[PDB]
Amino acid sequence: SRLDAKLVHTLPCFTFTDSAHHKAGETCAICLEDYRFGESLRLLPCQHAFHLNCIDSWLTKWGTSCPVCKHDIRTETMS
Ligand SMILES: [Zn+2]
Ligand SMILES: [Zn+2]
Ligand SMILES: [Zn+2]
């Protein structure tokens, strides 16, 4: 169970700045590192954000759901 990388790369992404600071949270759950100013993040439809590289790795290689709340992505297709 994994997602096509070309699909994962269309997910919304943003930079960790003062504006995104208190919407995205403080720490990436995938690597446990606190976000630093200027880092690249991605947002999942379940409203959890991660390091862009971290969630891309998870969705393309390891799983098909959010690693925090297990919200499944693309259970059924075409539809
Ligand atoms: Zn903070
Ligand atoms: Zn991370
Ligand atoms: Zn989630």
**Rounded CA separation 41/18 (Å):** 13
Three-class secondary structure of residue 7 per DSSP: helix
Q: What is the DSSP letter of 28?
A: -
- Expressed in angstroms and rounded, the spacing between residue 31 Cα and the centre of ligand 1 is 17
Q: What is the DSSP letter of 18?
A: H
**Rounded CA separation 23/47 (Å):** 10
- In angstroms, this model's resolution equals 2.1
Q: What is the DSSP letter of 35?
A: P
Strand partners, 27: 34
- DSSP H or E segment with residue 52: helix 52-57
Name the token pair of 70.
């297990």
Residues bordering ligand 1, an ion, CB closer than 5 Å: 26
- Expressed in angstroms and rounded, the spacing between residue 26 Cα and the centre of ligand 1 is 5
Elucidated via: X-ray
Name the token pair of 43.
């947002």
Nearest CA among 12, 17, 46, 40 for reference residue 28: 40
Q: Which ligand is nearest to the CA of 20?
A: 1
Name the token pair of 78.
């075409």
Residues in the chain: 79
